[PDB]
Amino acid sequence: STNTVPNSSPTAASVSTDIYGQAVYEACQTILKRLEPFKKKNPDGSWEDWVMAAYQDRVSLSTTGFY
Amino acid sequence: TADELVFFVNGKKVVEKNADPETTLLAYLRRKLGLRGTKLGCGEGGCGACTVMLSKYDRLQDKIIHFSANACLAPICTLHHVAVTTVEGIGSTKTRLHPVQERIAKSHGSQCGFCTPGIVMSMYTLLRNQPEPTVEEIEDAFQGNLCRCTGYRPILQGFRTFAKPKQLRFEGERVTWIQASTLKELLDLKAQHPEAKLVVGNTEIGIEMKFKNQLFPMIICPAWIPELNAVEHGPEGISFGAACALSSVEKTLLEAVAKLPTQKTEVFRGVLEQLRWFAGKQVKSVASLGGNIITASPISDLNPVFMASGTKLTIVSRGTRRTVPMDHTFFPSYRKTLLGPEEILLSIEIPYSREDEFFSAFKQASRREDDIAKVTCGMRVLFQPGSMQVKELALCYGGMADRTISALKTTQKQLSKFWNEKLLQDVCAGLAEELSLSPDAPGGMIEFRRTLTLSFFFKFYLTVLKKLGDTVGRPLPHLAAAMQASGEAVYCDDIPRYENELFLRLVTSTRAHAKIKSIDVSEAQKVPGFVCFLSADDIPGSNETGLFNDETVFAKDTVTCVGHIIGAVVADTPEHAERAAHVVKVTYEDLPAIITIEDAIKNNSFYGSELKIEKGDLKKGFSEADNVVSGELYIGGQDHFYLETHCTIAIPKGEEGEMELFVSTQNAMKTQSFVAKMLGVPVNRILVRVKRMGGGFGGKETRSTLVSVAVALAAYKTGHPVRCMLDRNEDMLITGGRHPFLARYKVGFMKTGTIVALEVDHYSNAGNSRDLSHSIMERALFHMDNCYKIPNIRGTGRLCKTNLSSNTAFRGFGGPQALFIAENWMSEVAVTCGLPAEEVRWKNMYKEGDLTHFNQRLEGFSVPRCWDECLKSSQYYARKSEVDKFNKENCWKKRGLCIIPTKFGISFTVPFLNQAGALIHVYTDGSVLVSHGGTEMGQGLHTKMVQVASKALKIPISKIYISETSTNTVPNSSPTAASVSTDIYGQAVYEACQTILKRLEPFKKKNPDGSWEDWVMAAYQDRVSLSTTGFYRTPNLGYSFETNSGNAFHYFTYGVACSEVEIDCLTGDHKNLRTDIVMDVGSSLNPAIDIGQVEGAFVQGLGLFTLEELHYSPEGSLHTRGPSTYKIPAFGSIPTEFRVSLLRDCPNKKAIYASKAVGEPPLFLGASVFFAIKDAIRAARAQHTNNNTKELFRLDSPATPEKIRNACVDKFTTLCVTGAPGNCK
Amino acid sequence: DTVGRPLPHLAAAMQASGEAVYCDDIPRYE
């Protein structure tokens, strides 16, 4: 949708996997940096513990990625 | 074999070949004609949201007439050959706006916008009758129109600029309707079928059918018949046909009063007085005279007047004709008159008054019950020619029994007596006896009622004697205001339905506390279009819901309040879902219920343990005190009364559990979360979209989920789109309101007025789940100081667990309750010390840099400046003298003036909620789409966010747009609450804008003379992303109850209000004369928006403290369920002089562009009206009660006419007037 | 970690059942 990702190129030229793949990878990294301090504080915890603890510490769990 | 119904809408012919008698105009406009400008706000005639214009040819009176009407009550079967004009009919943004529409939009008369179309139509209808109205006519036009948002001032200011036939047969699913064309037909039909129900205006029948569950299989409408519409002047009086509208009666009678000599028009003026503050124009233009008479309500305002004056009734059936004067025998029993079942009322002759004949009518300024216990009367005296010797006396009363009655034994005792002091005494003794109420009489208010019967007579006695001897900082209108005025703004139920869309109706507990033994749907199954009944077993995921996981989505084995949701009906139309729901039978086994705060305390029924804040040494502060005062105070709850009730559409996609919802909510995240948990599905499957709400006020922070989850389950179960919009009566019963509070307190203070010690125990009524009750009580305790330095202090709070709907957030979130309790003991300190109230309050104020009771430092403390400034602009000292002078000169009316400050903490008291995200896209034409976590409820958040974005980006507002709020653009959003949305989304939008500017920078550098569009295109072609998030996190927050330190709030918003009232000591009624407000909002992003918030909040506060009264059966069932029994401020409620100022030169370093939160801080200033009322009562009591100037009397909130009247203890309340001994000179 | 695995198209089962929604499969407004 145009209101989640603006100004996108058409899904064309066989490159969608290459390029949207990189953009998704970069947004993932950003989320990983954000969750890191929480992973370190509680390394035996689950994904869900880290996410909640991030949310409760007012860390944003939303990001764009671009390539 | 049914005739075609033919009418007109906005010029266009409508032919309806299968007209159902049960279809309302509002239903037809919205669901057959696709015209959704006209709104549903109550369905009972009180709110005017559904106002339309109607045009029809009075064949008789011989002209086309135009008048307003409530579409929610107009049967389409009354509309044959009538023309309807709706808001769409007069103009729109797509063509041209009517001047009425443009004007209300530009004058800031529209916030949420839900009431705006109805108001537009009222004004429009006025202008079509009188192109150049007076101010009075303008205000009167809006009597039947309610607005919850604006405080009314800007609408009236804005509009000030305009000043100076064959029988038809219809056959529905259940009802057959006959439109009679002649008197013969009427009498014949009634003979063939005597049980047939007449309908004229349907303003009583509609209520019986919708709310009381009646069904009359045959209906005869006789409106067309000329004899039922004649106005005839006779030698004895003026006769009106039974079908004549109250507005025709009013107009005819006003013309007679203007023309004839006073002595002939005593009765006419009685009639007119009762018609004065009677519903609004919409009701008066459709309600018939005979309808009121034959309805025979115990609280009919007209029947007492007709009875007291011997108004002649001409009554007719086939062959029969008689003319009786109305007397006590006309109403044998509850809702019955003295007509046989064949008989119809034909005409009503209202008499001229003779020589030595006098008349008065009066009515109680409150109503708390559907049809009882509102005192209303007609009073008539006839003396011997030229004398003061009584020849006839009639005193007739409504609201003192289950029918209109006459005080026969009392008046008969007066025949031949003279009109003097002895007579006054004799009549009052008789009245108190003959009309006595047992202390358990239905309707309650025993003392007040008795008192009004006597005081109304006293007023009559006295009357008779007399008869003898960059746009930040700019006042930009709400961005949606024009479309709100035009009916183009889309609210949740205005979204079109899918061809396969279904409708849900909730099935609700009728018991406060009971076992659910069984549920039987076999009668509901017979309803056409029934689809299914849903309950707890249909839930695939979890039945465990609510903010603290202590609620069911559907009641399991027990119910815990009246309105506890048991289940739901799904059907093909909302009317079918409604009918089927009423007929689902639940079998209950009653359990011991706990209802009141006192019940809860007696039974130790609480959620958790005592909350506490404590500082200093109490046994010690009290030791040193010169004076110690203790007491107890109660403040009643409040209903939100958003003009748009709760509503959700749920769209199931059919893939992977996906669901898309549109909902009227302040809390998209919890909606998404609750719906997912109900369905047993990851949150990432659920999408929630909020365009706007027609009001929220806290009531849509959490409680919207009761409807959302149920509708979502229906969508899951059926595979169809499903929607539900609550009726007002359902909305008030189920969704919860403000917390009632009880307070037990004790203050120690010096001779001086200086406070030395305070202990307050607070008890809130929480209802049948936790919800936000714990946080609300924390806010309360944080505000128990108001603006005052208290060296030794202890506040406790306890949450009462009860079998009532769960109470929730309401504008102020516990603060107004605590602040009210604060000013109550403060007012008692001043009176006890015998010092001016403003001196005692000023002396006890915090200074710059003081610590609160929770050890947070007050920096930028502007209360002193607001106070100073309010004192001066309101001319407080001058007027105070004027108030004393007035009271020294008036016996039965008194004035009161009070000035009150407020401080209000800004932030969510849960630290993790103070976070906020935004998402911004710039498209390649340079247009900008902003999305943030906040929702629009009328407060102008999106307007403010566009102004911030435009300033941050350095581009015109016209290039920026905010469409909606959604969980797939900004996730994990806090509820739009705690007044901080401007602060936090302002900041988040700002950051996203900075990011975008940093990315465009190299392109502005390569090309500094290029337009925005050049740079945007150039960054696009350089593959620079034009999309980003922004995020904000309020710094330095974290209060600890165990160490009593850390900041609870980011900063404080301050204000001061002065109000003056005049009370009628004999009736408890009052007029708000003048209010001056000075508010500190820092540097306002939008002075028009902010002043609107000050004005609207203030008026909600004055509602809370003086008008709004919820009332329940002893068994916990809500009695007050609509506008007819729950009174929010109306146009006529606001101060005659209503002045608001924003404090100049006071930037706030804490928030976006130096602004401050404004949403909730000014609501409490409404209490200045309450304390002005208390001031005036004090003068009334010095007049008639005792001579103790340091008397403390309790006065609970709301200060309704009952409580005001009972506090004016006099020779009436005590019955000293009877000759009995009691309290009062 | 499924990268490099022959994971079936995530929507295939729904495509097999006719539950997968294409443009014209969206319900019409009244």
Ligand SMILES: Cc1cc2nc3c(=O)[nH]c(=O)nc-3n(C[C@H](O)[C@H](O)[C@H](O)COP(=O)(O)OP(=O)(O)OC[C@H]3O[C@@H](n4cnc5c(N)ncnc54)[C@H](O)[C@@H]3O)c2cc1C
């Ligand atoms: C918002 C609102 C506010 C109101 N405020 C007040 C108020 O302040 N004071 C007050 O007194 N009332 C008040 N009313 C009541 C109102 O006056 C009545 O509902 C109205 O006058 C009834 O007339 P109708 O034409 O609508 O009757 P309908 O609802 O159509 O009929 C009412 C009853 O009268 C019968 N009836 C009608 N005409 C005849 C006839 N000629 N012969 C025999 N039976 C007949 C019908 O069969 C029916 O049983 C209020 C109503 C509303 C909706």
Ligand code: XAX
């Ligand atoms: N017209 C209009 N104005 C309104 C509202 C409304 O519904 N309509 N509600 C209030 C409430 S009640 Mo609450 O803490 O959820 S108890 S905070 C709050 C406030 C929330 O909006 P910001 O000021 O943060 O943008 O708006 C106020 N102004």
Ligand SMILES: O=C(O)c1ccccc1O
């Ligand atoms: O502290 C508040 O005012 C508040 C308001 C809404 C929701 C949670 C809260 O703590």
Ligand code: FES
């Ligand atoms: S909806 Fe018609 S009066 Fe309220």
Ligand code: FES
């Ligand atoms: S603007 Fe009038 S009810 Fe909201």
Ligand SMILES: [Ca+2]
């Ligand atoms: Ca609660």
